[PDB]
Amino acid sequence: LHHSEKKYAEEDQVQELLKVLNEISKTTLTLDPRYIWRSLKDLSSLRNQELLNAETLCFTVNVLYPDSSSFKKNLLKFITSNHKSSVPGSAELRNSYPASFYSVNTEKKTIEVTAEINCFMHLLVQLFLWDSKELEQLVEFNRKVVIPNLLCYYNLRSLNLINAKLWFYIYLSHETLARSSEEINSDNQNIILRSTMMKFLKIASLKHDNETKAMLINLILRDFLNNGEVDSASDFISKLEYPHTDVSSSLEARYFFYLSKINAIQLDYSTANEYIIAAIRKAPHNSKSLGFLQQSNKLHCCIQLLMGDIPELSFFHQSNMQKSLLPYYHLTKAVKLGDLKKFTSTITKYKQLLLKDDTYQLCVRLRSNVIKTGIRIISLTYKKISLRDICLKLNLDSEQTVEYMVSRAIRDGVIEAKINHEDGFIETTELLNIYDSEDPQQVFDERIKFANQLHDEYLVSMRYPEDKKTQQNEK
């Protein structure tokens, strides 16, 4: 029963291993093994549930174990394993073949097979752990082993993509352990984790690997947000080491998602408004990407309210995600109408929902945006309006309070008006008629630049996928 179960899944694993083994042996091809590893995550996740855990036991017995003898026993100890007589030395799939990792030349140490075998061995370990959701000692045991192993290897061009997906599980398993239980050792463990990310990122700068630095920057920028150091994130993004060429669309959307949150506290919403929009277009619309589109759209609605301009309300009702957008619907209504008591009562009941995403602190500063937007609305109504009539519509305190708020927004060019005290009304200084000025000409220049940029980007990849058609013999 259990004998035929281990031979079926192991044969499917070796079949996928021999495909990427011959591709890296001849010259250097990094494109083909990368496309297979994309589907490997989905095929292995479903396969780990079937045929239990016994598919990975004979794989370690097959190939030679540099470090991997005692690591599988520690993984099988937590599950209280019953003895099936799985002791190594029973099943032998090598049988002295060149593609089978010939044993005599391997045992004599005349050839080194450990490079591709050991780096691939650590990949299947983190996949089974993420399926069973194992924590505590098993998480710390892997972090201690992997770090010296990556420092010993020279990390060639093909070797940089093997551990590129392993760093994601290092930071993921550390955050799930802290949120599950808080202790004194969780803080000291994060100190070493910060130094490990920076040492490997600096080494990857010489190799100039596109996917390696893409996964690290996404994990490092998120670490600064949890640890709460802004000065580290400000200088980190100033170097601009993130390549835009071969990185995946899923990795690009995560990059622009962090820049919108960093610039949110810098009081510059001009550049932050573009990063949150570009992150939506780069993120897929599929079901697995719904988790990112849910959090990204919650930030976009908050940025527009911080800009003093009411965004388009059609995004809430037309989308199918409005169930989670209900708290943000009443926030825009309170800022637009300018009701003072409605805004205070909205953030009070929904404070629990806004605590998880940490957007409640930004809602505290929306209290100012309620009045600043209302002043902009009433200013665009009538060019000449009395001073005391403003306090009657918004139910303000006195005329001395509104006098400062109108002259406050004109510093950034918001209201664009003047207050006449001797006359008794506030006259708007905006006559429009910009058709005679040069201001629209500056915007028209940047629009054509976007056209010539896409034309050059159209030339980036055109003939490239067709380059292999001429060299390969056709009919």
Partner 1 sequence: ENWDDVEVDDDFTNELKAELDRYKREN
Partner 2 sequence: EQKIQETELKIRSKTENVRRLEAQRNAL
Partner 3 sequence: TTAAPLLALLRENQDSVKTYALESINNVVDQLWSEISNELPDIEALYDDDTFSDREMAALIASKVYYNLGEYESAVKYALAAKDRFDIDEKSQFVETIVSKSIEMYVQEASKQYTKDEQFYTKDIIDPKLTSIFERMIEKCLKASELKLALGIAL
107 binds, among partner 2, partner 1, partner 3, none (CB under 5 to 8 A by kind): none
Kindly give, in sequence order, each residue whose CB lies less than 8 Å from that of residue 221, ignoring residues fewer than 6 positions away: 233, 236, 237, 255, 258, 262
**Rounded least distance, CB 29 to partner 2, Å:** 11
314 binds, among partner 2, partner 3, partner 1, none (CB under 5 to 8 A by kind): partner 1
Work out whether 244 is an interface residue with partner 2 (CB under 8 A).
Answer: no
38 binds, among partner 1, partner 2, partner 3, none (CB under 5 to 8 A by kind): none
- For residue 167 the two structure tokens come to 């760093």
CA 36 to chain centre: 22
316 binds, among partner 2, partner 1, partner 3, none (CB under 5 to 8 A by kind): partner 1
Could you say which of 147, 203, 225, 325 contacts partner 3 (CB under 8 A)? 203
Kindly give, in sequence order, each residue whose CB lies less than 8 Å from that of residue 340, ignoring residues fewer than 6 positions away: 370, 394, 395
Three-state secondary structure string covering 135-196: CCHHHHHHHHHHHHHHHHCCCCCCCCCCCCCHHHHHHHHHHHHHHHCCCCHHHHHHHHHHHH
Could you say which of 317, 323, 341, 455 contacts partner 1 (CB under 8 A)? 317
Could you say which of 77, 199, 281, 388 contacts partner 3 (CB under 8 A)? 199
**CA distance linking residue 261 with residue 266, whole number of Å:** 9
The b/e string for 116-142 (b: 16+ C-beta within 10 A; e otherwise) is bbbbebbbbbbbbbbeeeeeeebbeeb
Give the single-character DSSP code of 339. Answer: -
Give how many residues touch partner 3 by CB under 8 A: 17
**Rounded least distance, CB 15 to partner 3, Å:** 38
Work out whether 463 is an interface residue with partner 2 (CB under 8 A).
Answer: yes
In 3-state terms, what secondary structure has residue 426? strand
Residue with tokens 């056209």: 451
446 binds, among partner 1, partner 3, partner 2, none (CB under 5 to 8 A by kind): none
Work out whether 109 is an interface residue with partner 1 (CB under 8 A).
Answer: no
- For residue 109 the two structure tokens come to 């140490």
The b/e string for 13-50 (b: 16+ C-beta within 10 A; e otherwise) is bbeebeebbebbeeeeebeebbeebeebeeebeeebee
Transcribe 344-387 into DSSP letters: HHHHHHSHHHHHHTT-HHHHHHHHHHHHHHHHHHHHHH-SEEEH
Kindly give, in sequence order, each residue whose CB lies less than 8 Å from that of residue 287, ignoring residues fewer than 6 positions away: none
Q: What does DSSP say about strands 417-419 and 425-428: parallel, antiparallel, or unpaired?
A: antiparallel
463 binds, among partner 2, partner 3, partner 1, none (CB under 5 to 8 A by kind): partner 2
**Rounded least distance, CB 378 to partner 1, Å:** 18
Give the single-character DSSP code of 97. Answer: -
Work out whether 320 is an interface residue with partner 1 (CB under 8 A).
Answer: no
Stretch that binds partner 1, among 70-78, 269-277, 316-324, 391-399 (CB under 8 A): 316-324
Work out whether 206 is an interface residue with partner 3 (CB under 8 A).
Answer: yes
Cβ closest to partner 1, residue 195 vs residue 314:
314
Cβ closest to partner 1, residue 128 vs residue 315:
315
Binding mask 199-238 for partner 2 (x = CB under 8 A): -------xxx------------------------------
Site for partner 3 in 329-348 (CB under 8 A): none
464 binds, among partner 1, partner 2, partner 3, none (CB under 5 to 8 A by kind): partner 2
> Contact positions toward partner 3, by CB under 8 A?
191, 194-195, 198-199, 202-203, 205-206, 229, 231-232, 234-236, 239, 241
Chain contacts with partner 1 (rule: CB under 8 A): 313-314, 316-318
Interface contacts to partner 2, rule CB under 8 A:
157, 206-208, 462-464, 466-467, 470
